[PDB]
Amino acid sequence: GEVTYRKDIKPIFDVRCAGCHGADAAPEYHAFKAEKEKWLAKGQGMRMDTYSHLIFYTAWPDTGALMRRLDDGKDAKPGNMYRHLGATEEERQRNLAVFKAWVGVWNLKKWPDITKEELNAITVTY
């Protein structure tokens, strides 16, 4: 039943996200932030193509980022990565629904403003 990285997220990510967040992307977040021009010039972001690399953007250290960037916006600006979830709105919604199940709670808050109880709700099953 339960939605997991191996069964449900990685198949989507490998198609829709790894083009700019895999082998050609910055090896880590701060690697990107320190030399953005290098990566941006190739249309690349930072590595998210492994489970440990992706959960970085959920509870800690970059808490809420995956939730913020994939948000469909229901002030209604979607996050700037939502478009990558599919070629039609129906596809985007279906795939967004898989990420919300995986993450647990769709918490958009940033690290300094989040509570331990809220952190507990981020499950992110492998």
Question: Residues comprising the binding site for Zn(2+)?
Answer: 30, 62, 84
Q: Which of 9, 17, 55, 122 binds ligand HEM (CB under 6 A)?
A: 17
Contact string (CB under 6 A) for ligand HEM, positions 86-125, x = contact: ----------------------------------------
Closest CA to 82 of 94, 62, 96, 65: 96
Residue 57 as a binder of ligand HEM (CB under 6 A): the answer is yes
Are 39 and 26 contacting, i.e. CB atoms less than 8 angstroms apart? yes
Task: Measure the CA–CA gap between 78 and 68, rounded to whole angstroms.
Answer: 8
Q: How many residues does the chain have?
A: 126
Nearer to ligand HEM, 1 or 27 (CB): 27
